[PDB]
């Protein structure tokens, strides 16, 4: 349990989207993750998996040049919640202030899963804790200018050995990308990412293994 509480682009720092205090200057999507909780695998076929429960587009955006870095800080992250950290992006039409999360066509732009070991092993989520509860996302240098939605996610696997036990923590952020990129992605809705029986979703931390198959589509 946790949420993205701060968003940095050089510098400019923005507050994250606290579900108990919707804030007009935050570029984080305004969701009903009031427990700072997760979306369960049975909901991976519903719009909740895009930007979290009942998420609504915010009226602010972070501005960032293609090729530069966004640094995201979580308010906290528990050591128990081992799992991958994944980043996706979708173009957004219009000013992105009325966009439906379920209609966004995302591509994956970065991922990290198991780093080393097993039972339970050391994971991207553990690195995120060691970094200071923070993660960096590089916006692809050839991404064309425009309005986009960044979807940053941890999938916690501490109960994922049981059916419906994985816990997905998506957090969406409105971006305006600037610069000299030329390419636009051809993505798919977030309901296409994951299934309850994917090997990286139904995954037992508490045994020996030497790899982890990261779920979702290929990095763009
Ligand atoms: Cu939790």
Numbering used by the authors: 1 to 220
Please give sentences taken from the publication describing this entry.
Discovered a little over a decade ago, LPMOs are metalloenzymes that utilize a copper ion to catalyze the oxidative cleavage of oligosaccharides and polysaccharides. The thermophilic fungus Malbranchea cinnamomea contains a host of enzymes that enable its ability as an efficient degrader of plant biomass and that could be mined for industrial applications.
The protein crystals grew as needle clusters; a data set was collected to 1.38 Å resolution and the structure was solved by molecular replacement. A fluorescence scan revealed the presence of a copper ion in the crystallized protein, which as expected was found to be co­ordinated by the hydroxyl of Tyr169 and the histidine brace: Nδ of His1 and Nɛ2 of His81. A succinimide is observed in place of Asp10, which is found in a turn connecting β1 and β2. McAA9F is the first reported AA9 to contain a succinimide modification. In comparison to TaAA9A, the L2 region in McAA9F is shorter by five residues and lacks the helical motif. McAA9F also lacks the conserved tyrosine residue of the motif, but instead possesses a histidine residue (His20), the imidazole side chain of which occupies an equivalent position and is likely to fulfill an equivalent proposed substrate-stacking role. Interestingly, McAA9F showed activity on both crystalline cellulose and on soluble substrates while containing an extremely short L3 loop aligned to the surface level, indicating that the absence of an extended L3 is not sufficient to define a lack of activity towards soluble substrates and oligosaccharides. While L3 in McAA9F contains hydrophilic residues capable of interacting with substrates, its considerably smaller size results in the loop being set back >5.5 Å from the +2 sites observed in CvAA9A and LsAA9A. In the crystal form of McAA9F that we obtained, the putative substrate-binding surface is heavily hindered by crystal contacts and thus it would not be possible to pursue ligand complexes using this crystal form.
